[PDB]
Design a protein around this ligand. Structure first.
Ligand code: NI
Ligand code: NI
Ligand code: NI
Ligand code: NI
Length: 210
């Protein structure tokens, strides 16, 4: 059924972000993060995240950063791989102005538009009951082959293409099949719009069944 396929795709997609959010919520309660605010040892913080990520590599964000009350105090260096500089990191932090939910952000980078889901959670100081700042996780959708692979496999379809309006952002194609991404855009092809906090974004997932 076409509707079954769309519902499955929607559920798999949501499940990926749910898995990351469970991690994000748990990590943000760590004394390691809280202590970083005072002692600012980046090697300790990076080694902490490195250990977690390697234990569950398929449910991890592309990059992380931390803010205090004034601005960014740390990032994991990975944002730069997506054309994001310090000024753009600053803007992301300001764009995600509320906690505990994924927001879809289309941001201009040094290499063009990048399309992300970004979430922030507060870092509580349990000595005072005040918030020290926020922890952010960013998922970069563009060229996210691992995500597309997961979407294709877990939905038992032949291939998937992610688009923003009309423009392809990512796909699962091997390169040897009788069709390419243009053929899929311009075989049973189903369109599943992506909903983020009940708003229909410009993002759509296209499944290909042969
Ligand atoms: Ni999963
Ligand atoms: Ni940097
Ligand atoms: Ni949903
Ligand atoms: Ni097939």
């Amino acid at each position: 059924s076409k509707q079954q396929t769309s519902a499955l795709i929607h559920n798999i997609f949501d499940s990926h972000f749910a898995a990351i959010q469970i991690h994000h919520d748990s990590n943000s309660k760590s004394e390691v993060i809280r202590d970083f605010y005072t002692d600012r040892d980046t090697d300790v913080l990076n080694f902490f995240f490195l250990s977690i990520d390697q234990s569950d590599p398929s449910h991890t964000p592309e990059f992380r950063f931390l803010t205090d009350h004034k601005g960014i105090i740390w990032d994991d260096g990975n944002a730069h791989f997506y054309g994001v500089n310090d000024l753009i990191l600053d803007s992301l932090a300001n764009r995600v102005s509320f906690s505990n939910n994924w927001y879809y952000i289309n941001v201009m980078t040094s290499i063009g538009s990048r399309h992300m889901l970004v979430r922030r959670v507060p870092i509580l100081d349990p000595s005072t009951g005040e918030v020290l700042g926020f922890s952010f996780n960013a998922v970069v959708l563009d060229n996210n082959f691992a995500l597309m692979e997961k979407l294709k496999s877990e939905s038992n379809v032949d291939n998937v293409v992610l688009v923003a309006n009309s423009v392809p952002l990512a796909n699962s194609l091997i390169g040897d099949e009788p069709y390419n991404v243009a053929d899929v855009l311009q075989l049973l092809v189903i369109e599943t719009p992506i909903v983020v906090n009940a708003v229909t974004t410009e993002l759509c997932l296209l499944t290909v069944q042969d």
